[PDB]
Tab-separated table of N, CA and C in Angstrom:
chain	number	residue	atom	x	y	z
A	1	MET	N	1.098	-1.122	0.360
A	1	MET	CA	0.008	-0.084	0.410
A	1	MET	C	1.106	0.811	0.018
A	2	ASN	N	1.136	1.891	-1.053
A	2	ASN	CA	1.980	3.459	-1.166
A	2	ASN	C	0.407	4.592	-0.459
A	3	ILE	N	1.746	4.223	0.778
A	3	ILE	CA	1.517	5.493	1.529
A	3	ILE	C	2.447	7.044	1.906
A	4	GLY	N	2.627	7.200	0.209
A	4	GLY	CA	2.159	8.542	-0.176
A	4	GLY	C	1.037	9.077	-0.537
A	5	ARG	N	-0.303	8.890	0.374
A	5	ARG	CA	-1.882	9.171	-0.562
A	5	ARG	C	-1.502	10.936	0.254
A	6	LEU	N	-2.779	11.604	-0.557
A	6	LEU	CA	-2.414	13.179	-0.324
A	6	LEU	C	-3.066	13.469	0.899
A	7	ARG	N	-2.077	14.145	1.608
A	7	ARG	CA	-2.640	14.893	3.160
A	7	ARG	C	-2.141	16.535	2.613
A	8	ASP	N	-1.723	16.834	2.200
A	8	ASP	CA	-1.298	18.610	1.836
A	8	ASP	C	-2.198	19.270	0.733
A	9	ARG	N	-2.073	20.467	0.026
A	9	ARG	CA	-2.085	21.113	-0.459
A	9	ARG	C	-1.089	21.572	-1.131
A	10	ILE	N	-0.613	21.719	-2.836
A	10	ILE	CA	-0.030	22.366	-4.065
A	10	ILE	C	-0.604	23.278	-4.253
A	11	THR	N	-0.148	25.038	-4.558
A	11	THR	CA	-0.497	25.312	-5.364
A	11	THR	C	-0.263	25.686	-7.541
A	12	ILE	N	-0.955	25.358	-8.145
A	12	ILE	CA	-0.618	25.507	-9.649
A	12	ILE	C	-0.327	27.302	-9.806
A	13	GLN	N	1.063	27.635	-10.234
A	13	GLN	CA	1.268	28.547	-10.884
A	13	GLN	C	2.351	28.688	-11.710
A	14	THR	N	0.904	29.006	-12.726
A	14	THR	CA	1.185	28.733	-14.189
A	14	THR	C	2.081	30.051	-14.645
A	15	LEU	N	2.290	30.021	-15.451
A	15	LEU	CA	3.359	31.754	-16.020
A	15	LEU	C	2.502	32.258	-17.240
A	16	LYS	N	2.031	33.300	-16.946
A	16	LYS	CA	1.461	34.873	-17.602
A	16	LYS	C	2.009	34.689	-18.180
A	17	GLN	N	2.758	34.868	-19.730
A	17	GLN	CA	3.540	35.922	-20.599
A	17	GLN	C	2.363	36.563	-21.406
A	18	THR	N	2.351	38.373	-20.940
A	18	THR	CA	0.732	39.129	-21.543
A	18	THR	C	2.029	40.148	-22.361
A	19	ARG	N	1.833	39.683	-23.403
A	19	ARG	CA	2.746	41.203	-24.519
A	19	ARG	C	1.982	42.377	-24.062
A	20	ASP	N	2.485	43.243	-24.899
A	20	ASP	CA	2.004	44.729	-24.012
A	20	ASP	C	1.688	45.581	-25.578
A	21	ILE	N	0.759	47.200	-25.547
A	21	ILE	CA	0.219	47.416	-26.740
A	21	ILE	C	1.697	48.223	-27.346
A	22	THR	N	2.472	48.153	-27.396
A	22	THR	CA	3.898	48.407	-27.730
A	22	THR	C	5.366	47.742	-28.579
A	23	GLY	N	4.892	46.292	-26.804
A	23	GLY	CA	5.463	45.423	-27.330
A	23	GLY	C	6.497	44.861	-26.176
A	24	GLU	N	6.294	44.836	-25.006
A	24	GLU	CA	6.766	44.437	-23.761
A	24	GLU	C	6.069	42.593	-23.321
A	25	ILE	N	7.380	41.966	-23.025
A	25	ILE	CA	6.589	40.542	-22.315
A	25	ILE	C	6.361	40.648	-20.776
A	26	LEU	N	5.115	40.981	-20.672
A	26	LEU	CA	5.180	40.817	-18.851
A	26	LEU	C	4.756	39.527	-18.626
A	27	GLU	N	5.605	39.141	-17.627
A	27	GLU	CA	6.124	37.784	-17.245
A	27	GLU	C	5.275	37.714	-16.044
A	28	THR	N	4.194	37.742	-15.057
A	28	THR	CA	3.942	37.115	-14.589
A	28	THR	C	3.205	35.576	-14.648
A	29	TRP	N	2.912	35.417	-12.394
A	29	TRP	CA	2.435	33.939	-12.266
A	29	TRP	C	1.194	34.094	-11.779
A	30	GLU	N	0.776	33.445	-12.884
A	30	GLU	CA	-1.125	33.560	-12.664
A	30	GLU	C	-1.081	32.239	-11.896
A	31	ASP	N	-1.606	32.662	-10.920
A	31	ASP	CA	-1.422	32.497	-8.970
A	31	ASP	C	-3.077	30.804	-9.701
A	32	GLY	N	-3.305	29.659	-9.461
A	32	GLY	CA	-3.700	28.497	-10.140
A	32	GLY	C	-4.987	27.638	-9.318
A	33	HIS	N	-4.767	26.514	-9.328
A	33	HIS	CA	-5.516	25.916	-9.467
A	33	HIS	C	-5.248	25.244	-7.770
A	34	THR	N	-5.476	25.180	-6.590
A	34	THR	CA	-5.012	24.048	-5.306
A	34	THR	C	-5.015	22.632	-4.757
A	35	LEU	N	-4.602	22.115	-5.550
A	35	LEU	CA	-5.126	19.986	-5.368
A	35	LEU	C	-4.817	19.486	-4.443
A	36	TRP	N	-5.323	18.679	-3.619
A	36	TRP	CA	-4.871	17.621	-3.553
A	36	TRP	C	-3.373	17.103	-3.540
A	37	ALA	N	-2.654	17.424	-2.444
A	37	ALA	CA	-0.835	16.617	-3.095
A	37	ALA	C	-0.634	16.182	-1.139
A	38	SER	N	0.717	15.290	-1.890
A	38	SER	CA	1.297	15.270	-0.536
A	38	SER	C	3.300	15.849	-0.705
A	39	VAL	N	3.062	16.701	-0.056
A	39	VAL	CA	4.932	17.539	-0.462
A	39	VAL	C	5.738	17.369	0.578
A	40	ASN	N	6.504	16.321	0.385
A	40	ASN	CA	7.844	14.969	1.194
A	40	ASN	C	9.512	15.653	0.744
A	41	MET	N	9.876	16.587	1.518
A	41	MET	CA	12.029	16.205	0.811
A	41	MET	C	11.963	14.932	0.644
A	42	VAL	N	13.629	15.317	0.104
A	42	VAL	CA	13.738	13.749	-0.190
A	42	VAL	C	14.284	13.685	1.416
A	43	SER	N	15.520	12.480	1.283
A	43	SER	CA	16.353	11.836	1.435
A	43	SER	C	17.554	12.178	0.888
A	44	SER	N	19.033	11.280	1.285
A	44	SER	CA	20.015	11.777	0.463
A	44	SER	C	20.216	10.742	-0.570
A	45	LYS	N	18.985	9.506	0.367
A	45	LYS	CA	19.007	8.452	-0.324
A	45	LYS	C	18.684	8.503	-2.210
A	46	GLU	N	17.177	9.656	-2.910
A	46	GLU	CA	17.302	9.698	-4.228
A	46	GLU	C	18.251	10.553	-5.678
A	47	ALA	N	19.313	11.535	-3.759
A	47	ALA	CA	19.794	12.435	-4.163
A	47	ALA	C	21.127	11.456	-4.918
A	48	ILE	N	21.986	10.379	-3.674
A	48	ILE	CA	23.029	9.863	-3.980
A	48	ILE	C	22.823	9.038	-5.026
A	49	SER	N	20.422	8.311	-5.651
A	49	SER	CA	20.927	7.805	-7.376
A	49	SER	C	20.731	8.424	-7.672
A	50	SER	N	21.215	9.502	-8.399
A	50	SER	CA	20.720	10.426	-9.010
A	50	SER	C	21.476	11.186	-9.023
A	51	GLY	N	22.540	10.842	-8.531
A	51	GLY	CA	24.194	11.827	-8.791
A	51	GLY	C	23.971	12.943	-8.611
A	52	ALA	N	23.585	14.103	-9.217
A	52	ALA	CA	23.890	15.503	-9.268
A	52	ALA	C	22.385	15.908	-10.268
A	53	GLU	N	22.260	15.158	-10.206
A	53	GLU	CA	20.133	15.835	-11.259
A	53	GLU	C	19.471	16.056	-9.649
A	54	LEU	N	19.098	15.565	-8.804
A	54	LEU	CA	18.701	15.522	-7.933
A	54	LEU	C	19.370	16.165	-6.846
A	55	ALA	N	19.642	17.043	-6.536
A	55	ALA	CA	20.182	17.384	-4.991
A	55	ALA	C	19.862	17.112	-3.602
A	56	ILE	N	19.901	17.341	-2.636
A	56	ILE	CA	19.676	16.810	-0.664
A	56	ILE	C	18.529	18.041	-1.026
A	57	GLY	N	17.607	17.713	-0.565
A	57	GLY	CA	16.748	19.448	-0.313
A	57	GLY	C	15.159	20.033	-1.385
A	58	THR	N	15.645	18.737	-2.393
A	58	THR	CA	15.053	18.715	-3.162
A	58	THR	C	13.096	17.588	-2.710
A	59	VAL	N	12.861	19.084	-3.037
A	59	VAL	CA	11.032	19.004	-2.852
A	59	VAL	C	10.176	17.514	-3.990
A	60	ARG	N	9.993	16.772	-3.249
A	60	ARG	CA	8.654	15.683	-4.246
A	60	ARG	C	7.595	15.849	-3.540
A	61	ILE	N	6.843	15.070	-4.411
A	61	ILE	CA	5.843	16.184	-4.036
A	61	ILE	C	4.661	14.993	-5.379
A	62	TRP	N	3.742	14.650	-4.158
A	62	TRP	CA	3.007	13.608	-4.729
A	62	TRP	C	1.648	13.476	-4.425
A	63	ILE	N	1.144	13.867	-6.165
A	63	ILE	CA	-0.156	14.226	-5.856
A	63	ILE	C	-1.256	13.223	-7.042
A	64	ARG	N	-2.823	13.455	-7.820
A	64	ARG	CA	-3.177	12.038	-8.419
A	64	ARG	C	-2.615	12.424	-9.819
A	65	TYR	N	-3.208	11.733	-10.695
A	65	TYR	CA	-2.582	11.906	-11.847
A	65	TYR	C	-3.352	12.949	-12.577
A	66	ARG	N	-2.213	14.116	-13.524
A	66	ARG	CA	-2.264	15.238	-13.471
A	66	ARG	C	-1.713	15.430	-15.014
A	67	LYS	N	-1.899	15.632	-15.825
A	67	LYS	CA	-0.625	15.884	-17.680
A	67	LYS	C	-1.173	16.933	-17.760
A	68	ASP	N	-1.820	18.004	-16.474
A	68	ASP	CA	-1.592	19.349	-16.848
A	68	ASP	C	-0.305	20.394	-16.509
A	69	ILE	N	-0.219	19.187	-15.011
A	69	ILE	CA	1.377	20.509	-14.642
A	69	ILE	C	2.322	20.374	-15.485
A	70	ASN	N	3.111	21.173	-16.079
A	70	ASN	CA	4.367	21.641	-16.684
A	70	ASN	C	5.735	21.817	-15.794
A	71	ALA	N	6.723	21.407	-16.246
A	71	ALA	CA	8.021	21.886	-16.207
A	71	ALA	C	8.542	23.529	-15.189
A	72	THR	N	7.534	24.155	-16.402
A	72	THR	CA	8.316	25.379	-16.530
A	72	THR	C	6.997	26.646	-15.252
A	73	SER	N	5.779	25.731	-14.265
A	73	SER	CA	4.710	26.097	-13.992
A	73	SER	C	6.213	25.823	-11.627
A	74	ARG	N	4.988	26.548	-11.334
A	74	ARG	CA	6.154	26.509	-9.344
A	74	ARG	C	4.551	26.443	-8.885
A	75	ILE	N	5.625	25.233	-8.010
A	75	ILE	CA	4.455	25.074	-7.409
A	75	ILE	C	4.981	25.823	-5.490
A	76	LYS	N	3.640	26.563	-5.287
A	76	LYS	CA	3.208	26.884	-3.578
A	76	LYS	C	2.706	26.324	-2.687
A	77	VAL	N	3.407	25.545	-1.662
A	77	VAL	CA	2.893	25.442	-0.823
A	77	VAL	C	1.503	25.453	0.240
A	78	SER	N	0.057	25.252	-0.497
A	78	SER	CA	-0.694	26.192	0.498
A	78	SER	C	-0.893	25.820	1.806
A	79	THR	N	-0.977	24.121	2.725
A	79	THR	CA	-0.712	23.814	3.288
A	79	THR	C	0.173	22.925	3.738
A	80	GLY	N	1.126	22.746	4.854
A	80	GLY	CA	1.918	21.545	4.845
A	80	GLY	C	2.953	21.915	5.530
A	81	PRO	N	4.469	20.804	5.236
A	81	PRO	CA	5.728	21.510	6.308
A	81	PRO	C	6.109	22.414	5.772
A	82	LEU	N	6.139	22.484	4.547
A	82	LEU	CA	6.196	24.335	3.394
A	82	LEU	C	5.164	24.739	3.223
A	83	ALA	N	4.883	25.537	4.393
A	83	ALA	CA	3.304	25.969	4.307
A	83	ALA	C	3.551	27.163	3.927
A	84	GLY	N	3.464	27.873	3.204
A	84	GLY	CA	4.282	29.745	2.628
A	84	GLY	C	5.361	29.364	1.726
A	85	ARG	N	5.933	28.098	1.596
A	85	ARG	CA	7.225	28.388	0.271
A	85	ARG	C	6.817	28.430	-0.735
A	86	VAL	N	7.340	28.522	-1.361
A	86	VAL	CA	6.953	28.360	-2.992
A	86	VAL	C	8.299	27.791	-3.570
A	87	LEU	N	8.411	26.598	-3.692
A	87	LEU	CA	8.792	25.941	-4.945
A	87	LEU	C	8.906	25.939	-5.827
A	88	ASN	N	9.524	25.147	-6.827
A	88	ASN	CA	9.928	25.605	-8.186
A	88	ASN	C	10.192	24.427	-8.926
A	89	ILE	N	8.966	23.414	-10.622
A	89	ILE	CA	9.487	22.363	-10.800
A	89	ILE	C	11.188	22.233	-11.616
A	90	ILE	N	12.014	20.859	-10.908
A	90	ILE	CA	12.480	21.281	-11.764
A	90	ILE	C	13.313	19.642	-12.935
A	91	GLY	N	13.673	19.644	-13.483
A	91	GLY	CA	13.482	18.098	-14.269
A	91	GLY	C	12.156	18.759	-15.631
A	92	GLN	N	11.120	17.762	-14.648
A	92	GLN	CA	10.177	17.600	-15.546
A	92	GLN	C	9.290	16.865	-14.999
A	93	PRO	N	7.891	17.275	-14.843
A	93	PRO	CA	6.616	16.259	-13.702
A	93	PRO	C	6.563	15.177	-14.396
A	94	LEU	N	7.127	13.590	-14.726
A	94	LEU	CA	7.853	12.123	-14.588
A	94	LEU	C	5.777	11.641	-13.680
A	95	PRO	N	4.901	11.668	-14.756
A	95	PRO	CA	4.155	10.661	-14.846
A	95	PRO	C	4.328	9.354	-13.898
A	96	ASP	N	3.881	8.639	-12.926
A	96	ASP	CA	3.351	6.807	-12.462
A	96	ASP	C	3.009	6.353	-13.953
A	97	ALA	N	3.857	5.238	-13.556
A	97	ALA	CA	3.615	4.236	-15.047
A	97	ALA	C	2.519	3.330	-14.207
A	98	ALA	N	2.102	3.415	-13.573
A	98	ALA	CA	0.471	2.912	-13.763
A	98	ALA	C	-0.133	4.050	-14.090
A	99	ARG	N	-0.380	5.547	-14.709
A	99	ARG	CA	-1.543	6.207	-14.152
A	99	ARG	C	-1.887	6.990	-12.985
A	100	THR	N	-1.630	6.395	-11.785
A	100	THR	CA	-2.613	5.818	-11.059
A	100	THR	C	-2.350	7.094	-10.186
A	101	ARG	N	-0.709	7.637	-10.448
A	101	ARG	CA	-0.862	9.326	-9.715
A	101	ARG	C	0.005	9.842	-11.254
A	102	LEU	N	1.295	11.162	-10.511
A	102	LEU	CA	2.297	12.398	-10.694
A	102	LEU	C	2.864	12.277	-9.815
A	103	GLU	N	4.404	12.454	-10.032
A	103	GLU	CA	6.248	12.887	-9.241
A	103	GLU	C	6.138	13.794	-9.873
A	104	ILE	N	5.691	14.727	-9.212
A	104	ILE	CA	6.092	16.587	-9.668
A	104	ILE	C	7.204	16.143	-8.559
A	105	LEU	N	8.107	16.522	-9.501
A	105	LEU	CA	9.613	16.801	-8.614
A	105	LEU	C	9.675	18.185	-8.424
A	106	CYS	N	10.418	18.862	-7.720
A	106	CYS	CA	10.883	20.423	-7.089
A	106	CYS	C	11.645	20.855	-6.530
A	107	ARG	N	12.296	22.010	-6.187
A	107	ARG	CA	13.155	22.421	-5.116
A	107	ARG	C	13.332	23.889	-4.851
A	108	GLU	N	13.431	23.885	-3.134
A	108	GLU	CA	13.191	25.202	-2.626
A	108	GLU	C	13.791	25.951	-3.881
A	109	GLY	N	13.066	27.581	-4.213
A	109	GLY	CA	13.398	28.803	-4.981
A	109	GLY	C	14.146	29.299	-4.654
A	110	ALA	N	15.458	29.405	-3.702
A	110	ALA	CA	16.190	30.000	-2.919
A	110	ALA	C	17.068	30.798	-3.186
A	111	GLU	N	15.726	32.312	-3.576
A	111	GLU	CA	16.269	33.552	-4.198
A	111	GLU	C	17.039	34.957	-4.006
A	112	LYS	N	17.425	34.242	-2.866
A	112	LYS	CA	17.884	35.498	-2.232
A	112	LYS	C	19.259	35.981	-2.210
């Protein structure tokens, strides 16, 4: 029984790139749908496993199967262990092989 069921919530930040009446690209994050998630950070296990593609501190995010999530989206934790933190999606949102869920991988978007 996969114990990584939905306990928390995540917010899908889709990137609204709206052009201007003279023509600049106004890149803004259209804060979107807040769905059922389980937001669990990695151990050294899957970091060491992935070598240097993933890192120690990578945020894993387990949701039901949603092919709408993109790598250019950002994930803000509406509630959970990182309640208030906005993580950014690294690599690509990898769909579960049996299509029962979606493995969203992220890291803390430390902008300091």
